[PDB]
Amino acid sequence: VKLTTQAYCKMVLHGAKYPHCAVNGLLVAETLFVDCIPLFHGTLALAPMLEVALTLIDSWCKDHSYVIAGYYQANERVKDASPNQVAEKVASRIAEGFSDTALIMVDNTKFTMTIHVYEHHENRWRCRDPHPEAQRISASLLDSRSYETLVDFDNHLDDIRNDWTNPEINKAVLHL
Amino acid sequence: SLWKGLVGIGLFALAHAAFSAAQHRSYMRLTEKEDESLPIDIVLQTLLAFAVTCYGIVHIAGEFKDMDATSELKNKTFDTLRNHPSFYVFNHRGRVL
């Protein structure tokens, strides 16, 4: 049950690039979470795009021997932290194929220097307790004003030429 | 914006033609001939001024546009459509900063 620096980085980055709309993304492990994906922003109570995103990311992650094992949502309003039906459904669907996946919701009422992890473990996604350098990395890159070249999936559906893996940010944080 | 200069040149030349022709007319009424027509040069000058001026004013007149609505919808996405400015609310993450 580990937090990867780049995961948190991409996560809060997506949270900041669309700061007045609710967002979800998706963590991919091979429990160690290994890479975040920003996929959507907007309404999010609509299946088809979600269904095809899940399918495509499966077809692609098999090639590198990764499985998803992880969700995260971040509501639009700051003063709210509650696992709305949608995320519950998506995490019960992911745990039908993994049976250990964990749900995340960022508090967002601090949003500077946050996590609220749940876990199902036969319970309705109940809470747990807190388990650095990545914080510094986050702060620096945020003030680096770089979130404007972070592509999500919703962008990919308009301009196919993007790359939802965005390895530029990966190598960038690697240099730090 | 060279077509503007083209039009101003046509106008200037046309005015020069009008001046030349007025003074020629005065010559006519002064020598009491009142038989002859205008010299060719003036005619050619004014006519070319006219043609050139039209060819330039057509360009600078403006530009046509399609009458098929969806032409201007080719480049557009939900992000513009969704905002609804008259229903804005600010109790969100940005107020942190």
XYZ file of C-alpha atoms in Angstrom:
273
model
C 0.000 0.000 0.000
C 2.502 2.551 -1.285
C 2.182 6.030 -2.780
C 4.384 6.673 -5.814
C 5.674 10.220 -6.285
C 4.707 10.425 -9.969
C 1.247 9.039 -9.199
C 0.464 11.805 -6.701
C 2.080 14.287 -9.085
C -0.150 13.488 -12.068
C -3.123 13.134 -9.723
C -3.002 16.585 -8.165
C -1.895 18.053 -11.498
C -5.094 16.869 -13.173
C -6.962 18.106 -10.110
C -5.462 21.559 -10.667
C -5.763 21.887 -14.451
C -9.571 21.617 -14.192
C -9.998 23.036 -10.692
C -13.732 23.851 -10.811
C -14.978 20.537 -12.241
C -15.115 17.082 -10.719
C -12.463 14.709 -12.026
C -11.576 11.054 -11.894
C -8.434 9.239 -12.849
C -6.975 5.773 -12.611
C -3.922 4.235 -10.959
C -2.159 1.284 -12.589
C -0.032 -1.178 -10.623
C 1.705 -4.207 -12.157
C 0.302 -3.059 -3.095
C 2.411 -0.631 -5.125
C 0.667 1.859 -7.405
C 2.904 2.625 -10.352
C 1.309 5.225 -12.681
C -1.619 7.651 -12.686
C -3.892 8.443 -15.638
C -6.095 11.596 -15.686
C -8.744 10.275 -17.937
C -11.875 12.429 -17.457
C -13.439 15.649 -16.187
C -16.976 16.986 -16.384
C -20.163 15.116 -15.476
C -18.827 11.534 -15.155
C -22.263 9.904 -14.724
C -22.189 8.372 -18.211
C -21.089 4.857 -19.139
C -19.889 4.495 -22.758
C -16.706 6.566 -22.739
C -15.825 5.030 -19.377
C -16.433 1.531 -20.712
C -14.216 2.010 -23.737
C -11.483 3.680 -21.694
C -11.397 0.687 -19.353
C -11.343 -1.711 -22.308
C -8.545 0.105 -24.140
C -6.409 0.490 -21.044
C -6.785 -3.240 -20.436
C -5.741 -4.067 -23.999
C -2.752 -1.746 -23.622
C -1.622 -2.636 -20.107
C -1.524 -6.355 -20.883
C 1.343 -5.558 -23.268
C 3.447 -4.253 -20.357
C 2.033 -6.697 -17.770
C 0.225 -4.053 -15.721
C -3.183 -4.253 -14.059
C -5.238 -1.323 -12.869
C -5.877 -2.071 -9.159
C -6.805 1.563 -8.463
C -9.289 4.426 -8.811
C -9.433 8.009 -7.612
C -12.074 10.737 -7.711
C -11.935 14.406 -6.741
C -15.234 16.259 -6.456
C -15.608 19.812 -7.712
C -16.629 21.274 -4.354
C -13.892 21.480 -1.749
C -16.012 20.799 1.348
C -17.087 17.305 0.374
C -15.486 13.891 0.809
C -18.016 11.116 0.243
C -17.861 8.083 -2.100
C -20.707 8.869 -4.477
C -22.417 5.875 -6.079
C -20.423 6.011 -9.328
C -16.987 5.434 -7.812
C -18.445 2.696 -5.612
C -19.766 0.928 -8.708
C -16.488 1.272 -10.572
C -14.454 -0.026 -7.652
C -16.755 -2.977 -7.042
C -16.350 -3.752 -10.741
C -12.562 -3.490 -10.507
C -12.488 -5.661 -7.382
C -14.484 -8.324 -9.203
C -11.296 -8.847 -11.235
C -8.664 -8.010 -8.598
C -10.424 -8.331 -5.197
C -7.764 -6.087 -3.600
C -8.192 -2.746 -5.389
C -8.437 0.388 -3.261
C -10.417 3.581 -3.768
C -8.967 7.058 -3.264
C -10.581 10.431 -2.739
C -8.400 13.496 -2.242
C -9.566 15.673 0.657
C -8.748 18.816 -1.408
C -9.477 21.098 1.577
C -5.706 21.464 2.085
C -4.449 21.206 -1.510
C -0.948 22.415 -0.536
C 1.841 20.381 1.075
C -4.672 15.145 1.440
C -5.464 11.508 0.713
C -8.532 9.824 2.223
C -8.034 6.169 1.183
C -10.859 3.700 1.598
C -10.746 -0.084 1.285
C -13.519 -2.586 0.698
C -12.204 -5.704 2.515
C -15.804 -7.017 2.509
C -16.931 -3.615 3.906
C -18.496 -0.767 1.935
C -15.184 0.947 1.149
C -14.362 1.872 4.732
C -11.563 4.197 5.803
C -8.041 3.705 7.189
C -5.200 5.797 8.646
C -2.265 7.701 7.087
C 0.515 5.395 5.898
C 8.221 13.893 1.910
C 10.419 14.254 -1.181
C 7.451 13.764 -3.509
C 5.716 16.640 -1.715
C 8.627 18.912 -2.640
C 8.554 17.583 -6.210
C 4.823 18.324 -6.401
C 5.249 21.877 -5.120
C 8.134 22.638 -7.478
C 6.517 21.215 -10.602
C 3.181 22.861 -9.772
C 4.845 26.260 -9.482
C 6.812 25.261 -12.594
C 3.549 26.008 -14.470
C 3.618 22.783 -16.490
C 0.056 21.443 -16.114
C -0.909 22.990 -19.474
C 0.703 20.155 -21.485
C -0.824 17.319 -19.422
C -3.154 15.358 -21.692
C -6.116 13.405 -20.359
C -8.306 10.892 -22.162
C -11.086 13.421 -22.749
C -8.560 15.407 -24.780
C -7.512 12.272 -26.663
C -11.072 11.893 -27.954
C -10.801 15.271 -29.716
C -7.200 15.270 -30.998
C -6.069 11.658 -31.433
C -2.446 12.810 -31.791
C -1.896 13.131 -28.018
C -0.546 10.421 -25.696
C -2.453 9.682 -22.492
C 0.674 8.066 -21.026
C 2.457 11.462 -21.350
C 5.977 10.089 -20.660
C 7.324 13.657 -20.875
C 6.200 14.252 -17.294
C 7.643 10.868 -16.297
C 11.147 11.599 -17.588
C 10.836 15.156 -16.250
C 10.231 13.997 -12.678
C 12.959 11.400 -13.247
C 15.485 14.176 -13.876
C 14.569 15.804 -10.550
C -3.175 46.334 -47.935
C -1.841 47.270 -51.362
C -5.319 47.217 -52.907
C -6.122 50.416 -51.017
C -3.221 52.174 -52.703
C -4.414 50.734 -56.006
C -7.840 52.292 -55.502
C -6.388 55.644 -54.477
C -4.227 55.620 -57.591
C -7.236 54.957 -59.793
C -9.058 57.863 -58.162
C -6.141 60.278 -58.525
C -5.675 59.417 -62.203
C -9.397 59.812 -62.851
C -9.368 63.268 -61.273
C -6.378 64.227 -63.414
C -8.394 63.172 -66.455
C -11.322 65.327 -65.371
C -9.076 68.360 -64.956
C -7.430 67.850 -68.341
C -10.830 67.516 -69.984
C -12.254 70.631 -68.351
C -9.358 72.754 -69.544
C -9.608 71.212 -73.024
C -13.293 72.154 -73.043
C -12.289 75.712 -72.195
C -9.904 75.697 -75.164
C -12.830 74.578 -77.292
C -15.249 77.286 -76.172
C -12.404 79.793 -76.570
C -11.435 78.961 -80.152
C -15.148 78.666 -81.089
C -14.470 75.423 -82.963
C -17.104 73.295 -81.165
C -16.663 70.560 -83.771
C -14.036 68.121 -82.499
C -14.116 65.210 -80.069
C -11.848 64.516 -77.114
C -8.258 63.332 -77.569
C -7.793 59.587 -77.187
C -5.267 59.861 -74.334
C -7.793 61.250 -71.845
C -10.257 58.498 -72.774
C -7.787 55.655 -72.299
C -6.579 57.141 -69.018
C -10.053 57.417 -67.502
C -11.185 53.995 -68.732
C -8.162 52.189 -67.315
C -8.650 54.084 -64.056
C -12.221 52.789 -63.964
C -11.328 49.164 -64.645
C -8.419 49.058 -62.184
C -10.535 50.721 -59.508
C -13.278 48.127 -59.894
C -10.806 45.240 -59.776
C -9.445 46.624 -56.508
C -12.745 47.524 -54.901
C -14.008 43.996 -55.468
C -11.105 42.689 -53.398
C -11.310 45.235 -50.588
C -15.102 44.985 -50.497
C -14.966 42.053 -48.088
C -15.071 38.284 -48.143
C -17.762 35.693 -48.748
C -18.824 33.028 -46.270
C -20.500 29.638 -46.376
C -24.196 29.326 -45.550
C -23.872 25.837 -44.015
C -24.058 26.173 -40.231
C -22.031 23.110 -39.270
C -18.997 24.563 -41.059
C -18.298 26.667 -37.966
C -19.001 23.730 -35.624
C -16.175 21.543 -36.970
C -13.829 23.005 -34.323
C -15.742 22.938 -31.041
C -15.989 20.752 -27.955
C -17.916 20.326 -24.716
C -15.550 22.557 -22.759
C -16.923 25.701 -24.380
C -20.514 24.462 -24.370
C -20.652 23.374 -20.749
C -19.622 26.498 -18.858
C -22.997 28.268 -18.541
C -21.567 31.563 -17.232
C -24.810 32.720 -15.578
C -24.659 29.782 -13.149
C -21.114 30.141 -11.873
C -19.984 29.225 -8.374
C -16.581 29.724 -6.771
C -16.593 27.447 -3.686
C -13.936 25.202 -5.192
C -10.253 24.289 -5.116
C -9.010 27.515 -6.698
C -9.934 29.539 -3.610
C -7.060 27.731 -1.870
C -4.510 29.629 -3.959
